[PDB]
Every structure is written in structure tokens, then in C-alpha cells.
Amino acid sequence: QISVRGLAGVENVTELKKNFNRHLHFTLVKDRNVATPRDYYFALAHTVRDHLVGRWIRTQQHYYEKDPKRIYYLSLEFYMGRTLQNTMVNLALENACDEATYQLGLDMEELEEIEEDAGLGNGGLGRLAACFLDSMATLGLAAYGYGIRYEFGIFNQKICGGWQMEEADDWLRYGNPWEKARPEFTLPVHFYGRVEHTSQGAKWVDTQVVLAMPYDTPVPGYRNNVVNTMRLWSAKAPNDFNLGYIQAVLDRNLAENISRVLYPNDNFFEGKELRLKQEYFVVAATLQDIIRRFKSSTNFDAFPDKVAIQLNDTHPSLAIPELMRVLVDLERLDWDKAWEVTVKTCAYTNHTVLPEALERWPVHLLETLLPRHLQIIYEINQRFLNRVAAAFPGDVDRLRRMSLVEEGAVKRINMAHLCIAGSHAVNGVARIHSEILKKTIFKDFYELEPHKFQNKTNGITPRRWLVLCNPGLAEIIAERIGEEYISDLDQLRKLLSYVDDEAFIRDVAKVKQENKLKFAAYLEREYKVHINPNSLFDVQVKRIHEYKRQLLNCLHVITLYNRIKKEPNKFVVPRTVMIGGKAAPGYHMAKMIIKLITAIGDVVNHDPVVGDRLRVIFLENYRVSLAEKVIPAADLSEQISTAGTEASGTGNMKFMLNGALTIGTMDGANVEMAEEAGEENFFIFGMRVEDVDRLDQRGYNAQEYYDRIPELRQIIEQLSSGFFSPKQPDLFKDIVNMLMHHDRFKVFADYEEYVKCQERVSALYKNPREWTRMVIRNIATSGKFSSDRTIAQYAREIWGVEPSRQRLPA
Amino acid sequence: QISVRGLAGVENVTELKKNFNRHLHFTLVKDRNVATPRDYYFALAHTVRDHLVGRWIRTQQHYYEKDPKRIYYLSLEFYMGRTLQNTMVNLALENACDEATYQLGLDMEELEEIEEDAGLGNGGLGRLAACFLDSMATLGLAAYGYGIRYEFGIFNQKICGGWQMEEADDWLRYGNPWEKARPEFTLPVHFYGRVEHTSQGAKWVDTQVVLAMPYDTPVPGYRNNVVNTMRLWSAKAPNDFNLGYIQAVLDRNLAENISRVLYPNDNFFEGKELRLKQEYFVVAATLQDIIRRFKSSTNFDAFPDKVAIQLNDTHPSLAIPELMRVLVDLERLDWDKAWEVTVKTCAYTNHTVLPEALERWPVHLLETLLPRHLQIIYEINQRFLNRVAAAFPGDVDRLRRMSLVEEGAVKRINMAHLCIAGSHAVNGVARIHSEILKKTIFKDFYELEPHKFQNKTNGITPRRWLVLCNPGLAEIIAERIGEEYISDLDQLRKLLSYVDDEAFIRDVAKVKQENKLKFAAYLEREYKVHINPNSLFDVQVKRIHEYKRQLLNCLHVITLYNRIKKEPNKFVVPRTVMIGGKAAPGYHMAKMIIKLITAIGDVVNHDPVVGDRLRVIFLENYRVSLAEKVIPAADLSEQISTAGTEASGTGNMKFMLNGALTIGTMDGANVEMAEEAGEENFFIFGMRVEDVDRLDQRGYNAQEYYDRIPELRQIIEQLSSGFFSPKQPDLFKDIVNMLMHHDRFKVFADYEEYVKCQERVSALYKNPREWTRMVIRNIATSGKFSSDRTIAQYAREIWGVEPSRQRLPA
Numbered sequence A, B: 001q002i003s004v005r006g007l008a009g010v011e012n013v014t015e016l017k018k019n020f021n022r023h024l025h026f027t028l029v030k031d032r033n034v035a036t037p038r039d040y041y042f043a044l045a046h047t048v049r050d051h052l053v054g055r056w057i058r059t060q061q062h063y064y065e066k067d068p069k070r071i072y073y074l075s076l077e078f079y080m081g082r083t084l085q086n087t088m089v090n091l092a093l094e095n096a097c098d099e100a101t102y103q104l105g106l107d108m109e110e111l112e113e114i115e116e117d118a119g120l121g122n123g124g125l126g127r128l129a130a131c132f133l134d135s136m137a138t139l140g141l142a143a144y145g146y147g148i149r150y151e152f153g154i155f156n157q158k159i160c161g162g163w164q165m166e167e168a169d170d171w172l173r174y175g176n177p178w179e180k181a182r183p184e185f186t187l188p189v190h191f192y193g194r195v196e197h198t199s200q201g202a203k204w205v206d207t208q209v210v211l212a213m214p215y216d217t218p219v220p221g222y223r224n225n226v227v228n229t230m231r232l233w234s235a236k237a238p239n240d241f242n243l244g245y246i247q248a249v250l251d252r253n254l255a256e257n258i259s260r261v262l263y264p265n266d267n268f269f270e271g272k273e274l275r276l277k278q279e280y281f282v283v284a285a286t287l288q289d290i291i292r293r294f295k296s297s298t299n300f301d302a303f304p305d306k307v308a309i310q311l312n313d314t315h316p317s318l319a320i321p322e323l324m325r326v327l328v329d330l331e332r333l334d335w336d337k338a339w340e341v342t343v344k345t346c347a348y349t350n351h352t353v354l355p356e357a358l359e360r361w362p363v364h365l366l367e368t369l370l371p372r373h374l375q376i377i378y379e380i381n382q383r384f385l386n387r388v389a390a391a392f393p394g395d396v397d398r399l400r401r402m403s404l405v406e407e408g409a410v411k412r413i414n415m416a417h418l419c420i421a422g423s424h425a426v427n428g429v430a431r432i433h434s435e436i437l438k439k440t441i442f443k444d445f446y447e448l449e450p451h452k453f454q455n456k457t458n459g460i461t462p463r464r465w466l467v468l469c470n471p472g473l474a475e476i477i478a479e480r481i482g483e484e485y486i487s488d489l490d491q492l493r494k495l496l497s498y499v500d501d502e503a504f505i506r507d508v509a510k511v512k513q514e515n516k517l518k519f520a521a522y523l524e525r526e527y528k529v530h531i532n533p534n535s536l537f538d539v540q541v542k543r544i545h546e547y548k549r550q551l552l553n554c555l556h557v558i559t560l561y562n563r564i565k566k567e568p569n570k571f572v573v574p575r576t577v578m579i580g581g582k583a584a585p586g587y588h589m590a591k592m593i594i595k596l597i598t599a600i601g602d603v604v605n606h607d608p609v610v611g612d613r614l615r616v617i618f619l620e621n622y623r624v625s626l627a628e629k630v631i632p633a634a635d636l637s638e639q640i641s642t643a644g645t646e647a648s649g650t651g652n653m654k655f656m657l658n659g660a661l662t663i664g665t666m667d668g669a670n671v672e673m674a675e676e677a678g679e680e681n682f683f684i685f686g687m688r689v690e691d692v693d694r695l696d697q698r699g700y701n702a703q704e705y706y707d708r709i710p711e712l713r714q715i716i717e718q719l720s721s722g723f724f725s726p727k728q729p730d731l732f733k734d735i736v737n738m739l740m741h742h743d744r745f746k747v748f749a750d751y752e753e754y755v756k757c758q759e760r761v762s763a764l765y766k767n768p769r770e771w772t773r774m775v776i777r778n779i780a781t782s783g784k785f786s787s788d789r790t791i792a793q794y795a796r797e798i799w800g801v802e803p804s805r806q807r808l809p810a
Ligand SMILES: COc1ccc(C2=NO[C@@]3(C2)O[C@H](CO)[C@@H](O)[C@H](O)[C@H]3O)cc1
Pocket: A122, A123, A124, A125, A126, A128, A265, A266, A267, A268, A269, A313, A351, A352, A357, A429, A458, A646, A647, A648, A649, A650, A668
């Protein structure tokens, strides 16, 4: 159909049809008479998978022959989403498969909807890892993603009576055609035990053993025939485990629980033993695999020349003392040499400055679970503090501030401090965030080792986040500037010469309208909800958190509603306000915010006076697959975190690429997005970081805003009195109390500027031509935010490797 | 190579080679450079599996079109063993695959050794189910085996310091290429809850739900293109199960534990809740599947015309009240009609008379777990006892004897009584056993309903137990009488005309010697144990149990040892005495017997005076795959249970088919084996059932035998004094005490006759020609013991269906 989706050659289509039929028969053991849509999906998935295998085998043998430096990306989260369409896109098979299935009497888009998301992440951090894997393969890097194969990913969200309910994400129920179990490469992981000091060093003895079984998933690069590997570990009990008899076999579950479930927390540290076990499990299995591959290329001097380990936040921080453990205790290297190797091998990316998100593990937990690692951490700390003391003599408070060990009620290990000490590079994820690191939380460390600190602004893959989810936009762009931009997003700048082109203005607006129509149809079909496709689609999709200020959005919605009720016969630009996202199950306030959103919708959506002028919808079960649907449909992207709290954001970049305008604070990557597009083409409002600092020094008094803003007072009185909960008048008392007395994120302080800015949004939307011209200026300057740019920077500035766009032989 | 293994055609070999290479590449994602023997096994398994699928699909569609009466074989145990060679044998692919792999530079027999046994059974009962499935497919019956997919089968046995150690049988670790998951046919199973009586009947409410997910395994018939199904259920938690959050997901294990592990008891009832859950789980899921298939052919009058349910012992006895529950509570049939349908549908096979093996479930367990079923059982009991009372007026003791409910300390339900009441046919598994049922334990029931009671003597499949495990013997037979005997074992009678044939005598003895050489080589390679292949191979392999009297064998071994020590320079026929079998983990005496056997070996095998004249070896980890190796190698089969205790035995039949002579009591099928071969061709000794009865009336006094048999006294004194355990003098005190004071199985009473009979065995072995002629007379008369004969009898006399040897189109 469309050019960017590749060729549908007679030979290819014929071969795909026969292999589809072969898999339906031999693999699925079905015939066309009893086969269901799900059977057809699997037949297609197996057919497409077959095209990966040759490339996968030859890529890995190529790395063995060439022996390049290997990049190991360690993460507790990989938010992959669906794999079928992505694989077709990267292999240039989309049009061919569309044709082949059409000739078989099937609709490929219907088949695509059957696949479960691989939801092995919470949101931004896990999705970043996924985009990074795509870019590393596209740039021809010898890269491996290492994580945990959770049996249960992020929970499925159901809304019942306006409240969030959780159910298990049983994503493996029907099988996973993309993974290949590798039980032959199973490795032991040790827990508990005790440390024994001998004539020849320390020994870790009397341990409990859990097996780590790897599953490999292919990661295809964009049309370069490179296929890299994501290796995820699954926990298995040894066969002699606890070996009355029946109970001993049943108790195997205790060991295997390590890989059972993803902790569902976004930007929050939960210091539970099971989580610590997960963190060591991935680190210990991965490091053994790395060392084995290195030895099968004695001389650990060349280790950092052949190995780079990237730590995705502090979650895999145990890699540092584990590497030291192996080099010192097992390989018999002297401490100083082992440390040199460790520092040159490891690098650390920080993803957040929120205090409650930082990992600080109780010493007593590490003492019991990992006694040798605690000893190594103590030794690292002593040698590090000796360096600090030499550099800043007599500065006793600096010593206590910089220590890896924190004293108090319970002694804790600060994992961020451990990571900085044991890495040759430390980076933040957006310019403003990286600067905040050097000025505030890591100031002492920056003063000691300034060369260590870097910035690497986040990005998103334009394969998934443009070509896959928005083929209509990809096509109209390709018509003007060709296809090269898909792996070189900076080429989008060429679209600036089309901002006054009448045909292009028309096509951009047409594609958006089509996306909005399709999404409005999706909502009626799957959720029986009705929306006006002619309204402004105002979208805030992201995890529910106080810092992200879904509450500020709520205040604006109620403001709009109240203004309509005050002057019903006055014209207003119609809006569909859509808010979606999951709350962590134990996060009370986040669950209350969801209830508030649905409660507002219950009032607003059924008021006859409002009509089709304002609709409030909560998007249930926000996940990667839903993002791919709603983002291309959006007109307005809400990026409204309190300045200094969103380290980068990546949803922001997705919206910019897909033709939505942004209303946002100068926070995270928003700053750089506005810099790229020009501030005139961005809807910027609210406090800057400096303004937040000034307010904190003064003391934030929410009452002041309540007293001086009549429209805000009305809303608070409505919430308190039970306007949005008539049967339960005091339902939202917790929300009001927080807003009035203990709001860490200063919702009221940005209210006036936000509402004012929203009026400017509505004004521009009244002028379709000028709206679209501003959209074109955003799309055209979105190039910097490709994860290809991000990964190229990591490669050159941290890993010491050169990216390549050269094809491998097919 | 050999004729019975089929053709190796140029086309077939070429196609097998290319499909092998295709699977290694696409399915396993390997190349010849990194592939291991295990990879090669899987490539072969997938290649052979492909040949099943067409036949499997067409067989099942054929049954849908023809709508024959369906046979449902319900069992908690299916002891399948390995599948690769069996599939090749039944598809006539063995020689072709041997050639194809040879041309690829691989040894197929090496590849076959990689496959794990499917050990979903304890021994005889589970193996009978497996042979039955093979015969039902070979006889073209529309038959389905239904059971549980245990994650862990019968434990692997390790011998450490002469003691049995258990480890988990993680048989699914590397995957199972033979099964096809069918998550789309998942069914709910209900537990606990309460009964609510309404206007329109009873309702079972507030239940806990566990999902039953089916896995299908193909069961190929012998060269008839029929492929039947074994459907095994796996337990899955519903996604809202227990839905803080993390613990709720972890607690899913509680539901899924139902299908985790096989109870490892042979002929013993363990009344645990988990076992009851397993029994209902298989019954509830299976019955829903049966009813669905019946409705997709309202009128339940024709149900028994289209459905037969065979209960493999009382383990699936809950099928009776479950069927009543569905028909009465859900389908709204009147009780009398539902009962008529149930009785005509169900039939019950009893497999044991040992009191400790009979299922008697505490009422309090059924009350809590299955409250509606208990109510139905009470109603069945009342109506049944009303029938008994009408037939035998005033016989109050008969009423209490026949009741399904047993009174006492704890009230129990007698499941055997339930089965007899609710089945139209009840059978024992050998003539002597079926007679014992009518004369003793079920006498009252036989008097009420004589027409119900039948015999169906057990059998074994000649495919696995001759062609597969002993191709050399199969070939020399085929050379004389052709190939038809493989599916018509009665044709072996034609070998009687060759008993004086000098060439045949030579060939039979040659095949045995070759088997003995191969097995002696297997022992050195895998266990570093050395044996004389010129010695008489004296073998007792079966589960360890007091009733099977491994202890009687031990007494003979020590007798032989003592006689050698008394007269060292006197010639004796050299023997290798081999004993193998697993003990149930909680069966103390059985574990003590294993230790005794190894302790005897420790003394006997290292005595320089004995030399190579006597060796005692314990065969570790006895299982189906080991049976296939040792049985063809055996000279003497030990079948020495106390008369009246072994219901049938099936190991006995395996040895007879493979050219071993039998030393045995007149117990189980031994009686019929001797009848078929002639008593002159069997080594019969010991008490008959009548003699055991006489001794019981008198009172068994072991001291009497001790006092009057000097050779027996010597052995007991050796055991007691610590001759076989010098470092632990009193190690075998429990064994001596049991033998002397509480031996239920009268070991001493058969000692003299046993030793005498063993002397006659040695005498005949000294004459190779006459030994072999007697062997030929055994093989020639083994035809009755084919499971094809057994299944044909079930078909005609119980199920009301006609077997067919007609081919389906290929
Ligand atoms: C479980 O602990 C955490 C889970 C998630 C996270 C984060 N999720 O999103 C964050 C940080 O990382 C993204 C990728 O760099 C950034 O774009 C977000 O701004 C940041 O909040 C931090 C800790």
C-alpha cells in the first residue's frame, strides 16, 4: 500500500503464504477449519521469526570472528511491548506480509492486536532500555541487554466503580514465540552463607544455590541485517533442593519466586528482601556470562578494552562489588588491579533526583544475604574516604556526606555513592538534570572527580515511535524527503522548507484527522465510549504520580467546566481531555487521583448544558500498545511536572514526533525540546527551577493562592463539599488536605499561569492553518530526540566504540 | 539393517536429512559448529514429530465425521517412558532415520539416550495405562487417555552409602517436544464453598476456582495411521487470584501446586488433602471435556451409547458423583434417569486387594473440599442400602459391611464400594485376582449383582516390549514366521514347530548372549561396575515392597554365599544377581531392604574366595528406560510375591516375551503364564493361596522355621550379629524383628521350597541346549499376554465396541 512499508514481490508473497500454511499445520497442529484468529497470529509470528534466525546466527558468529568490544546493558526493566510489527518494519517485510495474509483472507491488523505486550517495565526507565536496544542494533554495536524474565510483568489495570483494580499480567499464558530457552547455559547464583578467611584469601561458603536459566530474544536493527540479543534470566531450583518428600518438592517455589513478578513502583524505592535477591540474581548470572565470553575470545588488563558494563540506575549496582569479588576471590588479582579494571569497565546512569526513589539498603539485609559483598563495600568505602580526606584535609562533614555508609536508626548503604565511586563515567538523562546532579545531590563527588560527570539526553526510537505507530505521517514525510530520515532523524530539518507549502499543510492535518478518527473508533469498539473527533485531543498519559501533577490538569478541567456553567451560551473550543496511567498498588494518593479523574468525568460527561464541548475520559490500562494508538491521535501533549522533578521524560518526545503541540514546564527534556523548536512554537508556562528554589527558601504557603484566586477557591470548595462525590461527601478530603497543607509539588503555584497558557492553546486551535504550521515546526526539529543520537553519544563518549550504519550480508 | 525396522528408501532418507537440518537451524537456532548431542536429539525428535501431525489431524477429524462411541480412560498415572523410538517403530521410520542420521555423521542410539523418561507413574499401574493406550490406537478405537501433567514425575533414585536418596525428576527442564499446549481449551474447576438449596434444586456456591489447562500428546497405533490423544491437565491460577500485591501474585503457587508432583506410593493409600485435590481436578476437567464433545456431536439417553468411562482403580472414583452432580444440578435431569446414565457409562477396574492400598477418605475432608459431592454420596448410599435391604431382609450386618460410609473413630467413605455401586462392570486384572474379589473383599456385592463381575487379565504391548527393546529377537522370529505377529501375538505359537530346529536354538541363544554383552558394557560405562557375561543373569526388578519379597531373594543370595564359603573348591553355576527398584520415600522397611541388598553386595563382591562365581548388584534408578535394557538381558525372572498379594504383575510378562525363564509362586498372572507354557516349563514353588489361608487359620509362627532349618538360622544370626554391618552391628535389627515376629508375608514359610527350586534352575542352566528349548516354549506361548488381547476383551465385553486392524489413509 504505502512506500515506507517495503516491497510486496511475487516470490516473497508466495513463500510467506506457504510458510504460514506450514506453521499452521506442523507447528500449531491445526487446519483452516478449526483455527481461530489467535492461531493465525501465531502462524504469522512463526513465519516472520524464521526470517530472523539466519541473521541472528550470522550476527553472533560475526562478533565471535571480529571480537569487537562488547557492550552490556544491565537493567531490571525492559518494556518491549509487542514484537510482530516491529520485526516486520526492521526486516522490510510489512507490505509483503500484508499482501500474503490478505490473499489468505485475513486482516493483518486484526492479527497484530492478539499479541500480548511484553510488559517487563513500569514506564519510562524500562521503555528507554527498549529504545536503546533498538538503536544499538541499528548502529551495529555488539550489544547485549541483560535482565530478568518476569513471569508477571506490570499488572493489568481495570477500572471498577472509578477505582483502580489490579490483575496479574499472565503474559506467557499462550507462549512466547520470540524467545529461545537456553537451558544448556544455566548458571549457579549464591545467597546467604558466611565468609571464611584462609591462608589464601577469603572464601564464601555454606551458600544456598539458585539456578539462572537464560532465555534469548532477538533484537533486529533497521534494515542492516544485524540481530542482537536480549538475554533474560529465569530462576530455577536445583534438583536436590531441600532433598517430607512432597513438601520439599513444593518448597522449590521459594527459590523460583525470584523471577516471578516485577515490582510495580515508578520512582519509588521499596527496600524488600525479594527485590534485593532480584538485583543480585541478574548481576551474578550476567557477570559469569560476561567473563565466560571474555575468556572464550587470564589477562584481565585487557578486560576494559573488550567489555563495557552500563548500569541502568543503581538497580544493578551490585555489579561493582560482584566484579571485585570474582577478580579478587576467584581470579586472585590484587585489590588495586581489580579496582582499576572495575572502574574502567563500569559506567552509571542516574535517572532521578527524587529522594524516595534512591536506593539505600539496610546493612542488616546485606549482612545476611550477601556477607562477602558487604565486606567488599566496606573496603571500597574506606579506600574512597582516604582519597577524599587527602583531597580535602580536615573537612570532616564532607567525609560523612560522601560515605557509602549512612549512619542513623538503621545503617544503610547508599547505592548511588557506590556507583559513582566504582564507575569511570556518571551521566544524567537531560541537560537540566545533569546540571542538577553537579549542583546538588552529587556536588561533593563532582568536586572530587569532575571528569566523571557527563550528560546524555534521552531519546526514542523513530522506528517504533513513528514508522510503526504512524505510517501515514511517515509516508507524507517520505514523499518529500525520501526514506533516509528513519535512521538519520536529523534529516527532518528539511521539512522547514515546507512550512509554507499548501499541499504539505493539508497532508499533515489530514493524517492527524485520520488518526483521531481511528482512535475514536477504537474507543467505541473496545470501551463503548463516545467522543467528538472534531474536538481538541488534550492528552496526559504517563504513570500516576504527585510530581507529574495530573492534579494540576484536573484543576484546569474543573475550571473549564465551571466557566461553561457560568456562561453556557458562550463559544468555547471543544476539548476531549484524556488522562491515563497506572498507579503503584501501594500508593494511596495516586489511587485517589485516579478516582478523582473518573469522578470529574461522571459529572462533566453527563451535564446536558456542557454537551459535546467538554469530555473527560480516563484511558484504562495505559501501556506501550495503547501509547502507539493514542500518541498519533493527540493534539496537545501535557508535560506539566514541577520544574526540577522529571529527570527527562520520553513521552514528551513521542508526542513531538507525532504532530502534537506541547504545553509544559521548563523541566527535563522539555527545555531542550523548546530550544530545538524555538520557544515561540512551544506552550511554556510556570515556575523555573530557580523560582521553585526561591519559594522553598521563603516557605510554600498554599493558603496564599487560595485566598487570592477566586476561581481556585471555588474548585477547592466543590471538592470539599462533595460536589464530585454526593453519596460520599468527604471522599476527597485527603486530596484537599494535601493540596492545602503538604503539597511537595506546588500545584497551586503554577495554576494561574497554566490556565492562562491553556487559553492561548485554544486560541491557536481556532486557526487550523497556523496550528498546523506550528506542528510542522515541531516535527521538523524533533531529530535530536532520536535514541540513535543518544546511543552514538554513549558509544563515543563512554563506551569507546564507533557506531556503524554498514549492512551485514543478508 | 534389520527387516522389522522398515525400509530406508532414497527419497525418505533425503527428505529426513533436509528436515533435520531445517529444524536444527530454524527450530533450535543452532549450526553444526556449536550444536551438542542434545541439540541433535531435538532436531531428530522434531523431524519425527512432523510425520505424526498429518495423521493426528486426520484421525481426530475422522472421529468427528464417523461419530463412534468414545472411550475415556481416566488415570492418575501414565508411565510413558521415552517417545522417540516408539514413534519411529509405529510409523515404520526406524531404518530410514538410522540411515539419515548415519549419513549426517551421527549415531541414532546415542541420540535416543538423551531423551528423559516421561515418568508420570509409580510402576505397574501407570505402565499398564501406557500399554493400554498403545493397544487402543493399534486396534483403531476412538480412545482418549486423561490424566495430570505432573511437573515432577517419579523421583530419580541415587544410592549414597548404600542408602536410597531422592531427587526431583525435573523432566520438563529442556522442554517436551511431544506435547502440544492447548490453552484455548482451558476449563474451570471448583473447590470448597457451600451448598445452597433453592426452589429449583441445589446450588454449589462461593467456590474457589482453579483453571485446568490441557496438553495433548499423540499416541500412534502400529502402522495403521491412527493417532489418538492423551490429554493431561495442568493447574493454573485465575488472573484475579487473591486480587499486598506482591504476596498475592506469589500465592498463585498454592493453586498451581495441584499438578506439581506425583505421589510416589506403590500399593499404599496416603489420605492427604493435596491428593484429593488432584483426584477431583482430573475428574472435573475431564468430565466437562467429555460432555462438551458429546454435545458437539440435550438427549442424555444416548450418552452411554456414545461414551464409556473406564476408572483406573478408585483414584478417579469422584467421576461417579461428579457426573451425577452435572446431570442433576446443571442439566436438570431427575435422579433416577441420571443414575441410569451414570451406571451405564462407568466401569471400574480394581488393581489390588492389599488393605493399606484401598482408598478410604475421611468424611471431614470431603465435607470441606467437596460439600455437594458428599451429599450426593450420602444419597447414593441410602438408595443402594435400600436395594440391599430388599434383597436380603433382616441381614443387618450385611448393611453395615456394604455401606459406602464406614463408622469408627473417624467416619470414612469407602471409594471401592462407591465404584461398584455406580458402575455396570467391575473387573480384576488376572483370573486368580478376579476370583479373590468374588470370594473375599467384594463377596457381598457379587451376591447382590453377580452380572457386574468380570476378569480382564493384564497384558503388555509387544511393540515397546519386544520390537523396540529387543530387535535381535524380533528379527530372528520374523525370519521364520513373518511380521504379522507384532499386531497378532498369538502367532508366536508357530514357534513351537522350531523347538527342535538346530539353527533356531542357536539363534535364540546368540541373541540372548548379545543382549547380555551389551548390558554388561552399559554397566561398566555408566556405573563402572564389572560383571561376568557368562554367568546366569538372575534379575528381580520392581518396586520395593514387603509383599514382593525382595527379602526372600536376599535370603537365597546369602544361602549361596554361605554354601560357597563352606565348600570353596566345589563347582557352582556362576550367577549375577541383580535387584533394582525404588522405595516410597516414607516407607522405612523398604528403605532398609535396599540398604540390606547393598550391604550383602559389599561383602559378597569383595570376598576373594567367591571370585566371579557370585555377584550381587543393585540396579540404581529402575525406570521404563532401564527395564528396556535389563529385561532383554535376563536369564531368570524373579516373580516371588506371597500367593494372593500380587494382583497380576506385568514385569513377569515382559521377561517371558524376551527369553527369560521364570521362578515364581502361583500368584497373579504367574498362574496363567504357567498354564499357557505348561508347568514343566516354569519354575513353580511355594505356598498356593489355599496354603496361606491354612497357615493364617493356624497362626504363622516364624520361630518354627528358624528352629528346624539350620541354614536359615545361620543367616538370621549373621544379620543380628553384624556380619553384614561390622561398624553398625545392630543396623538390621528392624528387619530381623519383623521376620521373626510380625511378617505379614511369610518369608520363612517359602524359604526351603525356594532354595530347592533355585537348585533346579542351576541344574538346567548347565545344559545350554535344554535351557534354550525351554525358553523357546515360553516365548512361543506368550501370545495371550499382549495388551491387544486385553483391550479387545475390554472393548467387546465392557465398552460395547468392535476393534479394527484396518488402516486409515496415509
Ligand atoms: C524502581 O525504581 C525506579 C523506577 C523507575 C524510575 C524512573 N522512571 O522514569 C525515570 C526514572 O527515568 C526515565 C528514563 O531516563 C526518565 O525519562 C524519567 O524522567 C524518570 O522519572 C526510577 C527508579
